[model samples]
Target: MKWKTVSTIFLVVVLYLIIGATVFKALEQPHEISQRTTIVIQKQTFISQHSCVNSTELDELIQQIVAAINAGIIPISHWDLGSSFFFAGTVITTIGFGNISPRTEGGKIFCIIYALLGIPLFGFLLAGVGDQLGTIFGKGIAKVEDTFIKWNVSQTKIRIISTIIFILFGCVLFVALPAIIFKHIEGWSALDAIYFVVITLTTIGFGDYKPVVWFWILVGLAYFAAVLSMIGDWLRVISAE
Candidate 1:
């Protein structure tokens, strides 16, 4: 309502963004060079398995291997232990992000059984978390509203501020931070990593950049579940405001 309050909000938003950028820069390496380096050594060993007729042939072979690994068609060592877990989760969530398929008859039968049992169960879990996150963030919203109430902030200001903060928090944690790690470990360009995160999280999951490592998918599952739940809560809060 007041210029003083409006000016302060603008200053706070700008400062918050500046701080976020600084943090992003500070997180250069993600400390995954050891893991990535090990993979590099392993890749070299595997590439050595190929016979080369000449330098050009070797370069072509190496490029082919690189493309294969990125596409998750080669060197994808484990699925029963890792990817199957992710696949089961996707089936239940109905996100069936199809890059790999259960090619075995038994695997297909198991998938059908699991989906029958688990899809309903996963919904119960989603509803439970949705309500819980809604309550937690609802209280959070109230705490925020009360905190700035002393400033005689307008209700509109409260809603806008809270909504922006919520969106920024989600973007940084689930999208921006992971983009940095994905870029470093996957050797993706920054924009590519961002695209991968958005596509995977949205469950469009056309499977161009399926994470070969299970760590990313595990994070993807938990993060997507929480964000999907939070979005519903956030929309309700914003609409009510």
Candidate 2:
């Protein structure tokens, strides 16, 4: 079989496994596990229920949280949604954020197992797609290079132009249009929408605000397209050189 076919098969299998693992893990948690997960929920509920509390209230909240854990709501003692967002951001950027990871031994082990197979598999898929794109756009790449050279532009200038185009596309699809839609959907302020864009594209996910479900799905798709566009631009540069 062709290398591309092999890569396609490998990626499909890897994706299936990752999805399977996520589903399995989601469903297989013990009753004790559900209890532990509920600790965070209860804490959030307590805060919501009590509009304000003094030091005693704070202590009681901690006590209740602890009690819930003993009763089987996992403590989730030090989890950070913000940090998870950070991790997701780094992963997408290929940066591999090293700070603030899963605290549970099982969680850590599962993460390691997931990343071991998933990360490389994701990379392989990206590379395979990039290769296929390069093949299809060979002439267009040549034309872009020729056009730039004929304009007496430096290679650096060409790259800069490409980068600017990518950023503008990101701004339009990821920031501007989404911001408009989010403002309408969530009754968010303009600033809130702008903040959402920055946080999302930068992968600094602060869960204080997320696009509504459908909006998020659209944003995700756009982000993926942006990444592919950047990859295409980079390929054009490399092939030209």
Candidate 3:
């Protein structure tokens, strides 16, 4: 039964990625085109100005450049202090993301020491908080179940309804609310914002949607910690069956 469940989930995830990839591609295309004009155009430093290049080859190279740049192969800023600082935090937290790494020897060595110390402390704190939230929510869910039973609700029906409600509330409160703020700040639409939310919360941290500024990333990680805790608790509750 567990094998069947796992396989079923794997199948659905395949479909989910296929559909989601297509939709997200559509959302990101305009942004890519915008990047082409705004970003890649500026970096035509690829082929030498005097060196003769074929138009077709030039176009293909340019496309590759755009794709590579977006993928973080190029980078936002190779050695920006702000980016380096955030990268360090992400690395230690295991949220290594759509991010750049320290390039210099000193920075790299510092990162090693930074992470060695940081991960233990961060892990201890994050772990404790996650467990705390999970326990509180787990008990809250138990109370809800007892209340539903006392109210003469069909346990199965009530469980189903409660699941739907929690999912809706989670989406609205965590995903949609954050998306709204992101849209306003980042000039993204709601769909694009939701894409960021999904990728971030899942910790897939694929290279496109990211918050760069130090302050926001700080708040964003804090936000993600809580959301992750809630998700962990939710799964613990559901997995008991």
Candidate 4:
């Protein structure tokens, strides 16, 4: 039964990734194209205005910058224990932000195998946490239903209202509140922080910001599992109709 469920979930994950990829490309590529033009224009103007830096010199500088980034020539080592832990977290969560990747052949091989094994292991734990949260939320909803029964509230309406409240409550705790914290701590704009939160929770794995928010990521994974389980329930109900 689990193998069947995992197989079904695997199919859904692939579909979700493909759909997300398509949407992100469509939404992001136009801005990327415009940004590229803007950068080139600024570079040319800077080169022309500042005679001290010629085109060739600027080209070399740009080349060096790119090389440094690709080589990861920074103060910190990617292989350091703390950084590696973050990398492991990203891999297990399937949020493989492309900031730091395996450079050696053996590391690459290990990373591939590691992800294959780690994802399902992490998924099981996340699902368990989600189910626990669901039970807690269900009990709260039951209490609300009991109180509202005296007011002659419809059961269907009660369910709908409770579900909405649960979703909003989760978003407030996991998304909005975390975004505000990130905005303050990471020195990112409000929009940027919210964008990162949505992207990371969805496991979209864009490496624009190699955020070091460990506990937030773990809790967000659990929150995502909660929402996904709810979606599965909706699908099952619809199929019975």
Candidate 5:
């Protein structure tokens, strides 16, 4: 096999292993903080609400919320499993808004270091992939240019039309579809759903509308699907020349 092929295979294997290990380690760790700490905080809050008739009930509710928050961190940590140093770099640099994130202080600090080393590496990898894809699709793009040239159409016009089409497709698939689904699941109005789509796709990740239960699983899948869709769109445009 060629050196390039061998290197690609090696990287693919390494990525799989790293993802698996990170996920497993995260799962093995406790999702919640110390129970003692939780109880202490709950007690303090309960005392503060002494005048309330339902103080006891409110305290229990707070404890449950804290537990849920801790449990939720498990999924968040698992989501990070799908990422790598490269992904972490993109995240820390504010290009995040993806399917994954670190929920712990340790993870966040590690992400900082990971991004420091991995951002440039990820950029290089993307450039490499782009170059390879461009080469692979060069013949098709040439045919497109030739066909358009025969029609006497300006190259600028062809490019603009192509771009518009790509953007429209992205809007329909990424923005519109997600907005509709979010509206249904979140019980938000259409406008709110649209806002959600905008925020999510833009990588804002405000955590205000996080999908709970099975909703989180769907959210994870949808987020990655959107990324893949964007990549597919880019490839299509590049191939169409």
Candidate 6:
């Protein structure tokens, strides 16, 4: 039965990624193609405008620039203090946004050790913070239940309703509001912002876009931790039967 469950889950995940990738490919590829065409036109115009610069020479120069960027040289330094902090956060969160990564042999070796220790440290922090949030929310639910007790309402029904309410509230506060802010601040489309939030919170870390909001990441992790704990309890109840 366990093997069946795991196999089914693995199959479902495969389908999930397939559908998701197809949708993103369909949505995003046109823009990328357009951008590539635009750049090609611009390069041709530049070479034509400059009689001294050969097309092949220009291509070589552009290829070098592309290589430099890939090698983490031209655009930005990955080891800058702020960037290192962001990198460390990603490491601990296991988000590891591949936008910037260790380039040096020493840095690479350090990262393995850092991640080994940091993953569990972040897990402990998430579990602790998540428990606190769970406790706080539980207290609020209990208060609400007290009011309903006078009407002799079913405890189970109240729990189910409160769970729905809490989930909706968390979605609005953590997910919807942050997505709105990202749309405004980052100029991401609504879909992009929502996609980013979901991806980051789940630690799926496609790393297509890097966000610099550690607070949101921490809070979201805690939210997910509490949610997973709730799901585990539900599973425990089911398994007992």
Per residue, candidate 4 scores C-alpha lDDT tens digits across 1-241 of 4698779868988999999999999999999999999999999899889989998899998899888778755424678898788788889988886646887799889999999999999989877877887788788888899998989988888888987887797678666886778777887776777677777888987683535455556667777766777798998787457
lDDT of 5 by residue, 16-36 (tens): 899999997787645444666
- The whole-model C-alpha lDDT of candidate 6 against the native structure comes to 0.80
* TM-scores for candidates 1 onward, in order: 0.56, 0.39, 0.54, 0.76, 0.40, 0.77
Ranking by TM-score: 6, 4, 1, 3, 5, 2
What's the lDDT for residue 50 in model 6? 96
| Model 2, TM vs. native | 0.39
Which is superior by TM-score, 1 or 6?
6
Tell me the RMSD of model 5 versus the true structure.
15.8
Candidate 6 TM-score, C-alpha based:
0.77
What is candidate 3's TM-score against the reference? 0.54
Sum up the clashes in candidate 3: 0
Q: Which sections of candidate 5 miss by over 4 Å?
A: 1-109, 129-142, 176-201, 206-241
In candidate 6, what are the lDDT values of residues 1-241, reduced to their tens digit? 5998788768977999999999999999999999999999998899889989998899899899888768866555567888788779889988766645777899899999999999999999888877887798888888889988888989898888897987896778676887689878887776787777667777878573435466567778788766777898987687567
Candidate 1 worst ten-residue window by lDDT:
206-215
| lDDT for each residue of candidate 2 in 1-241, tens digit (9 for 90 to 100) | 6798679768977999999999888788676698987986886677678768655677777799887655434543324676565454445434343334555789778777767776577567556654665465455556787899998989988777665755686678667876788888898877788777666544455442255653453444445644767788886687457
The all-Cα superposition gives candidate 3 an RMSD in Å to the true structure of: 7.8
**Clash pairs (backbone) in predicted model 6:** none
Can you give the lDDT of residue 181 in candidate 1?
91
